[PDB]
Amino acid sequence: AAQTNAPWGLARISSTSPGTSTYYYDESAGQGSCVYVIDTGIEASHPEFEGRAQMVKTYYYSSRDGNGHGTHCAGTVGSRTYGVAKKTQLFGVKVLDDNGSGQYSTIIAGMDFVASDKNNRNCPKGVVASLSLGGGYSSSVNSAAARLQSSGVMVAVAAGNNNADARNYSPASEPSVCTVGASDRYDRRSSFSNYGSVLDIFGPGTDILSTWIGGSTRSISGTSMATPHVAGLAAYLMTLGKTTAASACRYIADTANKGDLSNIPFGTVNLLAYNNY
């Protein structure tokens, strides 16, 4: 399948080169997979979600996304126009308040929630979790992400936006999950992207168009925007039977575009997520 005039990051994920604007993907499009977006919520009535998004948990007085960040990330995973996996099921877990903040104890509870809640959902092709959030190093946060991965969920986490080594941030620094850095449309490391040996992969993260609250769209930047590209890619590849939740990060790294990015610090992988379609 081909989507013309796609957001640059979708085109990038299906291309060996920067500078094109058509996204190519197998029409299965992540059908039968599920992606949990652990964030500020999802405006599930957005026409772009086509009834495939739903809230499954909140830790606040409402499940509404009063921020936009979670809706944007969910759109990059799975919206019809802005998403990688255009037929996946999206599940929102609101661990962040409408200012985008959340306590680590709430974030941990949300991760353990997903590890159990997937047993209440129909995801025959597999389960992914996208965590566009983080803060300073916490062994308890890393352990929660490790448990979620161990339970059979492909966990993709943002590297962080500190232009620093991700070893000092969580859950970015957890070795067993997929830690995602950000790149721009010219295949440069995004100026804010964290780096270091703990990164597994880069995805598009500068100037990413996606869904927003109020039935709208906008372009924003961050490792938060790169992470859902990788989460959606995992769901897509699992639907194709190419990989599994336990192996998808490694598979994405193995099949990535290699050596294409600039300003990659010595010791950080030079790997850009690629669907090999």
8 A C-beta contact, residue 182 and residue 202: yes
Q: Is 65 annotated as a binding residue?
A: no
What sign does the dihedral 256-18-13-231 (CA atoms) show? Answer: positive
Q: Is 16 annotated as a binding residue?
A: yes
Q: Is 175 annotated as a binding residue?
A: yes
- Listed in sequence order, the residues at least 6 apart from 185 whose beta carbon sits closer than 8 Å to its beta carbon are 8, 9, 12, 18, 19, 204, 206, 207
Q: How far apart are the first and last CA of the chain?
A: 10
Q: Are strands 154-158 and 53-58 parallel, antiparallel or unpaired?
A: unpaired
Which H/E stretch holds residue 231?
helix 223-239
Determine the Cα–Cα distance for residues 95 and 92; give it in Å rounded to an integer: 9
For the record, the structure tokens of 63 come out as: 């499940």
* Active site amino acids: 39, 69, 224
Sheet order of strands, 53-58 included: 53-58, 89-94, 33-39, 126-131, 154-158, 178-183, 201-204, 271-272, 257-258
Of 121, 120, 72, 78, which Cα lies nearest the Cα of 96? 72
Identity at 74, one-letter amino acid code: A
**Where is the binding site for Ca(2+), in residues?**
16, 175, 177, 200, 260
**Where is the binding site, in residues?**
16, 175, 177, 200, 260
